[PDB]
Amino acid sequence: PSQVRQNFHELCEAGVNKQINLELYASYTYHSIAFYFDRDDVALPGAHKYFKKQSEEEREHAEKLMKFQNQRGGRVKLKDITAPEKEEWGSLLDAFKVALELEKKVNQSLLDLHGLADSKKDAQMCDFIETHYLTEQVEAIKEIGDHITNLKRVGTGLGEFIYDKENL
Amino acid sequence: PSQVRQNFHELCEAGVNKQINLELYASYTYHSIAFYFDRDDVALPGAHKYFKKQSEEEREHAEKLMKFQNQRGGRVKLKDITAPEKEEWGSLLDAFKVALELEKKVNQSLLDLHGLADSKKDAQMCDFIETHYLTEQVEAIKEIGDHITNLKRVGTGLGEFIYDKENLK
Amino acid sequence: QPSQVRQNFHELCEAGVNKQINLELYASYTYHSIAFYFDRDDVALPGAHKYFKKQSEEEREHAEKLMKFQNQRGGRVKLKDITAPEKEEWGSLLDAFKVALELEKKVNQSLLDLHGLADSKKDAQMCDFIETHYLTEQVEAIKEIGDHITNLKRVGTGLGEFIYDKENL
Amino acid sequence: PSQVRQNFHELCEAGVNKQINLELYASYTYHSIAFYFDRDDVALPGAHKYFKKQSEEEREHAEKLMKFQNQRGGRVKLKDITAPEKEEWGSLLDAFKVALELEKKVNQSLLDLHGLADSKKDAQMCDFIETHYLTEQVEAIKEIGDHITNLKRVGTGLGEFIYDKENLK
Amino acid sequence: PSQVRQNFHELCEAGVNKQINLELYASYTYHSIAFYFDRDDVALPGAHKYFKKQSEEEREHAEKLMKFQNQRGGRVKLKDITAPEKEEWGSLLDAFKVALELEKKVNQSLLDLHGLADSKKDAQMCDFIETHYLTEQVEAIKEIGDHITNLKRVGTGLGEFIYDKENLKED
Amino acid sequence: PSQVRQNFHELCEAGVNKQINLELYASYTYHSIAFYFDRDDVALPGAHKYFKKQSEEEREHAEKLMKFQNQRGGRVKLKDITAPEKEEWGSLLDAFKVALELEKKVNQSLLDLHGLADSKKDAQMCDFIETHYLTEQVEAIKEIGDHITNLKRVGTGLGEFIYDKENL
Ligand SMILES: [Mg+2]
Ligand SMILES: [Mg+2]
Ligand SMILES: [Mg+2]
Ligand SMILES: [Mg+2]
Ligand SMILES: [Mg+2]
Ligand SMILES: [Mg+2]
Ligand SMILES: [Mg+2]
Ligand SMILES: [Mg+2]
Ligand SMILES: [Mg+2]
């Protein structure tokens, strides 16, 4: 056992390792969407920059968790990062619709992980997930909700280009 | 009778407390409108910022009447603030139409208050109403009128998003 | 149909938020009242006037923050009338700060009741939100008041109330 | 009971008073280590500066708890601060081995104190420990484990001198 | 067929997508090495900073080929990103040995991809790999070569600490 | 042993260690008086700040004697830091009355140590405590003297509050 390890269940160590995969998976999906909007047949430069930053924030959510593993004295176990479920993401609206599902999936995965923290009475692991993840997820989902509502209000023609140029 | 009271009738004093309530009611209604546009299924952040400023300005309107009351020797009496008329405020144009009837409602209240002050030969209350409320209210009604005219020019859909970003931010 | 953002947010919790925003605004309304009582010519404590105005506004932002929370999680903001304050005449500075200790303890307990509901329905984020923005700010507000109450007891009734107002408010 | 006391069990107060002593014992222990490295036969100036700072950072932890005791309306009870368990601390590696055993004892005291807090539905007190202590202890234990790993790597003689100059100042 | 596409063979398009995967594999491997050094039993914060950096440069190598794939009107195609060969990377010298082998592997695929571009008379694709990839990889291999020679010269204990603080925690 | 040791008596080492405990004792006592003024039913924030400043200055008095012990080549020996004599320190005037007596006890202790150093012809040790301790103690006792006088002058109620703002 690590010299720093105290109050850190091997089941919670496994839990964290499953999260860093989900986040890296999320990161990799935003990256696909990012470079899909750089396509000459799509040409939406604001979505390219927005989803590239969304991808970089998840490599960070993963790093922070990788950081948390070493802090608590766990051992980081990587698995393959699965390819995104799509190659063509359709409209700007379709892309945010995929974003909302991805974020809900990740939120739940953290809510279950937090569940597993409370269960084995890991007050610090809980704080860590409350403080860096749970409110940042709620913020992220509202933002995506707002984007969906505004992409529906704008049409699919002129409004898409304007929303791309102004709100991303 | 307050040591400061001079040429300040008790129906006028009653009249100021009725106005104070109308300002808090308007504030509350604009508070409602401001947070309806923060909803994920509405999401007009311009309208959010705008109606929040309008609510803070009606509280300042109430506060100046609260202050005025104390200046004249009167005594501030607070009633309940009635909840806004609706939960769901509809489109941007629907929200600004409510705002117009509201401001005409409080404008009419102020003009009646002026009339009362004037029948009781209270010059300084007339000046106070003239100076801080009546021109404020005409400007505020002309502003709302323009927003309505513009919200009808721009359509629903894209029109609502452009006007939100360009004219409320 | 639920809001497209709504996840892990029980309707008891939603209904909970809506109840706390009213209490927040009830408390804002009461502090406003204490505010302008100190602005009266026959009370004339301009420190206390400033202190309570600032207090009224902070609670409007506490409700304003809970309206943001409501919309973030997919809940729907529902306003009731804001009850009028319990008193017109708030007495001495010490009396006013005693009403503030009663009021902040009701509001703290209302939040601690709301957290427990949060915890009941395994709503981790709502618990963090009430812990982060409300529970520590309440404990700081109540201690400040106790200190004020103590210090208002230590100084006299007369000269002492003037100095405390000038100096600590 | 203090005029500010609300949802603060007298076992949570007793618990808070046990932790101020543990922080002061750790503070005192780091103070001995500090001045052991200032001895002409140890002469390690980085460790001296480091462990003085570690001692100063406790006492602040003791103070933040004495501070919270008063916030909640509890009553600070000061027991003897027990002498360090040694005069002679040995190597720089030997000192960080003691720090690791000390910080875990401290951590386990804080986790125990949190569970007692959770047991008596003291949401704010849990939030206090979570915010100010639980994360701090973890960062602190990781830092001490890194130090231990690093002083085994360079190992005795020049490696001790360099680790003192480069990684402690 | 893409409105911009001109003088871009479907096997070349196929080759670019194979490099983006190798570059994302390298980024992931350097990502794993990075956090190994942040373990409390490895505690080498210089190597952690340094491999953290080398990993982000590989996601940038991938992004430039993604960016290029789009410019030529080819379509980006994402395979799974294979988990790294190990969790126990060993010594600072061991990690730099795994890096000289990972970097000679990427360079050879890059040299084959250029060969293919030349084969298909794609001057621009060739120039593009010459400009952003070929001398960067040579520069990257020379730098790792020097690290290995230096990790060899310094000790296993104290030498590993100094070299971390001096040549990697700075850089 | 000690390669730096010269003209330093084993009773002088012992006296220094005895003085370090007295200074840490005073620090603890000022500490208690600190947070006693931080109570919601006492609430004198001036006194709180003043006594926190005095607790730190004594730990400093302790640290400088620890520093002196090592300079002369003696060995620091720590004992338990005795807990304060009271929990409830009463009035602002009560707390300064306690300060004076603590300061005089600590001063007489220094004057005994100086005497002991003089008896052993430790010229540097006498100057050390003359330079950093004996005059500082006289300045501290007289400051407390002024405080006691002024607290009697201001009296019990308002004057407590006014002296706490204006003069601490
Ligand atoms: Mg994420
Ligand atoms: Mg108005
Ligand atoms: Mg005029
Ligand atoms: Mg509040
Ligand atoms: Mg501590
Ligand atoms: Mg918590
Ligand atoms: Mg590369
Ligand atoms: Mg002293
Ligand atoms: Mg002399």
Author numbering:
A (entry chain A), F (entry chain H): 3 to 170
B (entry chain E), D (entry chain G): 3 to 171
C (entry chain F): 2 to 170
E (entry chain B): 3 to 173
From the paper:
Ferritin is considered to be an ubiquitous and conserved iron‐binding protein that plays a crucial role in iron storage, detoxification, and immune response. Although ferritin is of critical importance for almost all kingdoms of life, there is a lack of knowledge about its role in the marine invertebrate sea cucumber (Apostichopus japonicus).
In this study, we characterized the first crystal structure of A. japonicus ferritin (AjFER) at 2.75 Å resolution. The structure of AjFER shows a 4‐3‐2 symmetry cage‐like hollow shell composed of 24 subunits, mostly similar to the structural characteristics of other known ferritin species, including the conserved ferroxidase center and 3‐fold channel. The 3‐fold channel consisting of three 3‐fold negative amino acid rings suggests a potential pathway in which metal ions can be first captured by Asp120 from the outside environment, attracted by His116 and Cys128 when entering the channel, and then transferred by Glu138 from the 3‐fold channel to the ferroxidase site. Overall, the presented crystal structure of AjFER may provide insights into the potential mechanism of the metal transport pathway for related marine invertebrate ferritins.
